[PDB]
Amino acid sequence: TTIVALKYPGGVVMAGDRRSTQGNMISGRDVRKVYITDDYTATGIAGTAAVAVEFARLYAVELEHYEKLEGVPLTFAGKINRLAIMVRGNLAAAMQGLLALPLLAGYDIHASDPQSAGRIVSFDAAGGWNIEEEGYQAVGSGSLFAKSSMKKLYSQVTDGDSGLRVAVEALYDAADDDSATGGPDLVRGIFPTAVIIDADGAVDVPESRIAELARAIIESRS
Amino acid sequence: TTIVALKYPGGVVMAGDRRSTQGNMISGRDVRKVYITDDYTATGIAGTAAVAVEFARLYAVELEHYEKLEGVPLTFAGKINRLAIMVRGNLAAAMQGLLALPLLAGYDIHASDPQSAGRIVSFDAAGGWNIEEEGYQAVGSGSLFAKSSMKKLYSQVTDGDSGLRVAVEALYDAADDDSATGGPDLVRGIFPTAVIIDADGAVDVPESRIAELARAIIESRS
Amino acid sequence: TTIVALKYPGGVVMAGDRRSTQGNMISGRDVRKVYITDDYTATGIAGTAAVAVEFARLYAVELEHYEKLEGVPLTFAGKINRLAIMVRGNLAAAMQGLLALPLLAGYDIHASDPQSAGRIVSFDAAGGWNIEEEGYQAVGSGSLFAKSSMKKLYSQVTDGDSGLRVAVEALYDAADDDSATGGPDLVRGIFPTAVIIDADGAVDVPESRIAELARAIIESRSG
Amino acid sequence: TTIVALKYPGGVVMAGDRRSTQGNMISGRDVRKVYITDDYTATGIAGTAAVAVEFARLYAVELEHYEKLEGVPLTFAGKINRLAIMVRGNLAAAMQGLLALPLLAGYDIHASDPQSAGRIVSFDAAGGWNIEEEGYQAVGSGSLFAKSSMKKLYSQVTDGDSGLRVAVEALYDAADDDSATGGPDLVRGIFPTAVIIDADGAVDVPESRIAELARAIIESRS
Amino acid sequence: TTIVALKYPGGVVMAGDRRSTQGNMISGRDVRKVYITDDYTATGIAGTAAVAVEFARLYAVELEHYEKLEGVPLTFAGKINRLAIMVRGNLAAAMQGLLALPLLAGYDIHASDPQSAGRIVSFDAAGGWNIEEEGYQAVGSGSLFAKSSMKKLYSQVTDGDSGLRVAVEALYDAADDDSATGGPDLVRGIFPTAVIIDADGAVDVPESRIAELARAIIESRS
Amino acid sequence: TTIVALKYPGGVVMAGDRRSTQGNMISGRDVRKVYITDDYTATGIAGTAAVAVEFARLYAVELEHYEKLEGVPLTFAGKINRLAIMVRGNLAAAMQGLLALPLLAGYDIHASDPQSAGRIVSFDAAGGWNIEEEGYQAVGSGSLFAKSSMKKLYSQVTDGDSGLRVAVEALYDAADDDSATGGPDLVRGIFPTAVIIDADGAVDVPESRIAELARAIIESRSG
Amino acid sequence: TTIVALKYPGGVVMAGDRRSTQGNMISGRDVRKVYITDDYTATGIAGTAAVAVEFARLYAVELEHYEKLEGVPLTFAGKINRLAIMVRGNLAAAMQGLLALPLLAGYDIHASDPQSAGRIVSFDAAGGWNIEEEGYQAVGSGSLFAKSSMKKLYSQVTDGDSGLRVAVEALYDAADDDSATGGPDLVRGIFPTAVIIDADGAVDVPESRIAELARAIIESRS
Ligand SMILES: O=C1CCc2cccc(c2)Oc2ccc(cc2)C[C@@H](C(=O)NCc2ccccc2F)NC(=O)[C@H](CC(=O)N2CCC[C@@H]2c2ccccc2)N1
Ligand SMILES: O=C1CCc2cccc(c2)Oc2ccc(cc2)C[C@@H](C(=O)NCc2ccccc2F)NC(=O)[C@H](CC(=O)N2CCC[C@@H]2c2ccccc2)N1
Ligand SMILES: O=C1CCc2cccc(c2)Oc2ccc(cc2)C[C@@H](C(=O)NCc2ccccc2F)NC(=O)[C@H](CC(=O)N2CCC[C@@H]2c2ccccc2)N1
Ligand SMILES: O=C1CCc2cccc(c2)Oc2ccc(cc2)C[C@@H](C(=O)NCc2ccccc2F)NC(=O)[C@H](CC(=O)N2CCC[C@@H]2c2ccccc2)N1
Ligand SMILES: O=C1CCc2cccc(c2)Oc2ccc(cc2)C[C@@H](C(=O)NCc2ccccc2F)NC(=O)[C@H](CC(=O)N2CCC[C@@H]2c2ccccc2)N1
Ligand SMILES: O=C1CCc2cccc(c2)Oc2ccc(cc2)C[C@@H](C(=O)NCc2ccccc2F)NC(=O)[C@H](CC(=O)N2CCC[C@@H]2c2ccccc2)N1
Ligand SMILES: O=C1CCc2cccc(c2)Oc2ccc(cc2)C[C@@H](C(=O)NCc2ccccc2F)NC(=O)[C@H](CC(=O)N2CCC[C@@H]2c2ccccc2)N1
């Protein structure tokens, strides 16, 4: 798995690959790993498939549960805490091979400067949380390759479209070097998924746009 | 790794993928795993890269060593025996993770019928050897996928070119399901290697021919 | 990690580096490890990031929880004991890799001599606590380099600013010899954090003054 | 440790950091990890300090030993095989923590094409060797950051000085992310060492040139 | 650590060193290990610092707790039994390295013979207790050197002042042979602590007097 | 144990403490850990006493063995190599507990510049060797405290006598913070040993000069 | 077992107890543990009885073997090194429970003056040796008690007879606190053995002199 997230002026982008494996064997080509957790938050999870899916589903329910009980959504810091507490509670199972490693992207509607109101929070298996301040992060077996790609590419990010293009290229570099991260599949027409969040909320990125960017990267490197 | 070998009227073809890995990480993209070991014999090896390469080199040296000492090449059965003895001697190292599993193809010039002089021989880690009688064989982590692919496609093998096509398609199917087997890289222009052996001896298959077959396979799958 | 704390005439200083790691890999560059836990108390924690941040947040809540319930803050000795009990309760998880080692600096509003009212308390993984009397202390993987540096630098501590300078130079020496402690990052503009506590309370040190002192130390050592 | 090596038109460059550690503690700041092993060959080694230094000295003695005994230097392939056998012979000690992981850069005087006579060979702990054909390679705990950096910078390599600049920037990126790899120390004036090899042989790069490149990189990032 | 206790005509003295260690490293120089537990009782503890501190604190509150509840202090035997029960309750944790070993000195106001009301009680990690009748006892990593020193010097104990000097000299001998016991620090001006207990109760011994005895012992040794 | 080594203009000084231990128990007060191994070389060894002594005796015999067989002494590099090989050959026993870590000080008669012809070489348990280019080094349980001390004191080193004083003060700091390193014993008159090496060869430093420097240090720190 | 040894002006004394045990059970009451191994050297050995006895006999044979071969006895330093090598060679068996710890008391005929010719050498299980300079030493399970007793009594040592009295009293204190060290047996008439060594050589101390000193100590403490 590789899931990336990056800030751009006035929003945040999260993108993730589509592969699941069982050892060396490919067991999935269509996996959706990036979830719109609520109107202003997206979560992407690496690790054991059963746990990652359960984490995303339970987390979204917990956030909406608070909003309906209290009439107001949690602050973004509260959302961070609840995800950290979920991961911390899984630590024993994670030591037994039931690992979930999330990455959190959001847009804080209560931040002062909306141009920088995008948020990226990385986590570890002990429930540690760190709000990223350098503009991008990645999680999963390909995250090193994606972070090093984004390091060289982040200067190109000026808006949502270029942020999306950089995100897709980082996922391409991750799959280029990590066999557990799936590249774009032109035969089957399967591409990474992506969510973009700004002051108007989170939206799934249409597959056609990601297909366009993926084909452009492939064309460029040939 | 996946190495395939199959018989066609009047010879054999062996083809192998180009990938090396370290865990999840891709560490090689142009590995050549199919060696012409003498004028009528090719060997393909899966397993630990260091041991596999050393096996191929030492095996070819051993065969040519005997030929120069005695003025005639070993019989095909003799070549089998020497390869098996080599694998058997590595069993302890193989149990420590230094494994080499070879696959042997050849044209036996001392056979009865020239059209049935093709030979395919598989091996196991204990030095066992089995002369394949059912037309094809494969070795490596994607070998089961490649053999089940060849089971359905072998009926269309009627000559050297269709033999080659089926071998390349089998490797394509292995890469489709085994992340440790490399698919055709149309971006970098890297394709499986192949050797064809008939009464005129063993020759490397030009990459342009394999590239054309791989693109036709990819187009048919889309 | 290296957290340092030292007494100066009238108060106390605590400073800490900004690095987190996973094995050899650098995983954070702007980590804030020195917390204002109440108006006269600062806590700096080393060890497992998740546990360290949870300790600081829970400890600050615990002290304020008592203050609001009882109408008065805890005595400084009460604050020591609650922090020690928190560490002791974590001993089992700490043996399994979830370690948190705090360092405590404070200003005792109920002390006898206001110019010796500074306090520094070090802890161990079993919940042990020891009030330091020799003027400085450190915790973390670079703490021995820092303490041995402060041993030679402590004499120049006459007020709050010179105390801050010594704390920053100790952290510089710690990062000089310990790869798990971060030194000043002049390219990114990232520097250690610091808190000063005196009779008027605990305040964060502005990044600018720490940056000036770090550059002074740097070019003093480069020639 | 990070050792990088890359090809440029007419030669190769190899560069390595200066740090030695004992766990978290820095125990060395001026270590030289890149050795001129003969007039057309440089070796950079990562791993246990004692073993790395021994490997370099013995390997250089072995090559000159053969040259004086036989009157001609070994072919580049023979040089590869000798280093590979040395690594393979150390496998048991490396499993006990006495690991040496070399990277080999050379200029093949016997190549028919002097523009592409540069050679880069990587190795693994079992003595496996692979001639790199993508133009760059790295070894050590920061090699993945360095390789992902050179992936984005390699298109700027047009001569020896651009190649040297990319090699220094790759080492900068590795130290940026790997605490066991040393960045440029402006306070002490200690910079990565480098060797450049062309048809005229292998020569140490003067520290002044590497310092100027490091200052340019540092000011660019600021 | 070394804690000594010895009986003199009409009373008892207890003295302890000032050192704490973390393995080989010295981690404390002014630890106070001798506690006035109530008006007629002192306890010195060796072992894991956290457990020793906690033991002295909780034992003192337990004795005063009983006094305030029932209007009368515990009999000396009751004080012994409660301290033994506390050690016995710590046994499992003590076997994991959370060991506290106390030594109890006191003056029994309800003693049968008012001239021989001095009391010394030693304990073991299992909670065993033994009322010492040979006039002195010690605990800690230097207790054997201190007890053998006192075996020779105890004949000199004729009043409270000579008993104090012997206790301090026994601590000096323990520090002489045991690096985990701290000796007098003439540079910093730090000396063992002592408590003296007679019919008028237990009082802290002024540091000036201990320093005087320590300097005299140092001069008699040199 | 703590052994310190220190370059000064025109030579080197090496100094070592006198303590040996068995667990917490002190087993020796006058151990000599710094050996003149030939006319221009000294070695101090930390670790298992039996192994350290064996190492120093055998190494000295080896260097002189070559000199008598070949009519010239080994180059300094050759001397480094032989010590490294001796340590590497002991690695198996060292993993079993028979550990010896040497520190090599010497004056290279063949060096280009005689003023900086002093040489300090550190070693690890795997036979690794590194020629120290920063001027000082230390080995043993207290070596980190000693190196941090010398880091602050090294600018005072202008000749052999100031270098000897810094070395003695480093050993004093190491003993101050490491119970396995013995401090100056004024009651018994026992002080660290030291060897000074310059162009005229290696020579033991008399106990009286070291006692003088130790007393001056103790007095300065006592106020 | 306790073996003590002491320097006195112009000579040296060594004494040892007579007990052997198998666990708690006493197995011997008249064991002689101090051997005249040379005209000017004695050796006393603690540990496994079989190994201690064998060590004594072999060491004595070895020294006399060299003397008859070369015509001159070994220097005292050579006698030290030979006993050290013998202990080191037993180290593997010592770890399996075949332990011998010797203590060496000699008179060095080649020393400067007869007043400083006495020699005490202590050894450890690794073959370490140390020439003792504080005037006395002990070995065995009661050596700590004996050394502390001798620390208080050594000022009284002015000649061989006061040295012998201090030696017997140290052994008395060891047996007083160590059940593995035998005390004077008045019922059976068994007492510590002792060897005195001066310029006239090594002499077995008469039992009657030891019995006098034992009864004087026993009466002095009654
Ligand atoms: O390998 C397994 C077996 C279960 C297991 C138990 C204990 C330890 C363990 C693995 O050890 C492990 C083995 C393998 C992994 C982790 C741990 C990698 C991980 C992965 O690919 N994860 C990518 C991924 C990320 C987020 C969401 C979904 C998702 F597939 N793969 C896995 O867990 C695979 C997943 C798999 O094959 N299937 C087939 C049908 C259902 C399940 C699937 C669910 C949802 C989507 C896609 C597939 N399970
Ligand atoms: O992983 C390693 C390190 C050795 C090792 C350590 C621990 C366990 C282990 C293997 O256990 C293993 C780990 C991994 C494997 C086996 C065993 C898979 C195997 C493979 O891909 N094998 C495919 C292959 C087949 C035939 C010929 C060449 C060839 F690469 N990979 C490997 O051995 C990899 C190979 C590798 O990265 N390199 C980089 C530089 C040199 C070497 C290479 C040589 C030649 C060609 C291509 C690459 N070595
Ligand atoms: O290594 C990990 C994973 C958990 C783990 C697994 C196995 C062993 C282990 C710890 O065992 C350990 C592995 C590593 C350490 C301890 C234990 C060192 C310690 C550290 O740097 N600590 C410095 C520090 C001190 C105070 C507050 C924050 C802070 F980072 N690092 C850690 O725990 C690292 C921290 C880390 O990478 N991340 C990434 C995103 C979130 C988390 C972070 C939180 C908050 C601030 C900065 C970073 N987690
Ligand atoms: O850690 C050690 C001790 C040996 C050891 C014990 C246990 C595990 C282990 C290694 O396992 C290990 C622990 C640590 C490592 C490897 C293995 C990392 C490795 C390194 O930094 N290596 C970088 C490097 C690469 C090439 C050439 C030289 C060079 F230092 N560090 C090391 O081996 C360190 C090195 C070290 O401190 N010293 C001090 C003086 C001599 C030696 C040095 C020699 C030469 C140059 C610079 C320093 N030795
Ligand atoms: O070693 C540690 C860490 C806990 C630990 C981990 C692993 C094994 C272990 C103990 O196992 C042990 C390791 C070491 C020991 C015991 C067990 C010896 C013991 C000691 O010196 N004890 C002397 C002493 C006796 C009575 C009262 C106080 C006192 F310090 N030392 C200790 O526990 C040391 C103490 C220490 O460094 N600190 C620093 C700040 C707080 C604590 C302190 C409290 C109070 C007073 C003085 C110091 N802790
Ligand atoms: O503890 C022992 C026994 C061997 C042993 C057993 C189990 C574990 C172990 C070592 O593991 C160890 C236990 C203890 C240590 C290391 C390893 C520390 C080391 C030390 O002080 N080393 C300082 C030192 C350095 C150089 C030269 C001499 C010298 F003492 N101490 C030691 O080896 C001690 C030394 C000791 O008591 N004796 C008494 C009789 C002669 C011998 C001595 C020789 C020379 C000088 C001074 C003393 N041996
Ligand atoms: O216990 C045993 C059996 C050997 C053994 C097995 C397993 C573990 C072990 C020792 O481990 C041990 C168990 C017990 C000890 C050491 C190791 C103590 C040691 C001792 O007393 N030693 C005092 C002593 C010192 C020097 C010379 C002689 C001498 F007896 N006791 C011993 O070895 C005892 C000795 C013993 O009972 N006998 C009875 C008949 C002959 C033999 C004897 C020989 C020579 C002189 C006096 C007695 N052997």
Side-chain angles (χ1 to χ4, degrees), chain A residues 194-205:
Chain A
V195 176
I196 187 169
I197 324 188
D198 60 17
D200 290 320
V203 285
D204 288 298
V205 173

Side-chain angles (χ1 to χ4, degrees), chain C residues 7 120-122 130-137, chain E residues 27 30:
Chain C
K7 297 186 187 204
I120 299 182
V121 192
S122 66
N130 186 246
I131 304 170
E132 189 54 53
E133 273 160 272
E134 291 200 79
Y136 59 87
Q137 193 48 262
Chain E
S27 63
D30 41 40

Side-chain angles (χ1 to χ4, degrees), chain A residues 24 26 29 176-177 179 188, chain B residues 24 29 176-177 179 188:
Chain A
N24 38 336
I26 294 159
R29 311 190 160 93
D176 206 16
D177 290 318
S179 67
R188 300 180 167 89
Chain B
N24 281 329
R29 302 191 170 89
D176 210 14
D177 284 319
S179 66
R188 292 182 174 84

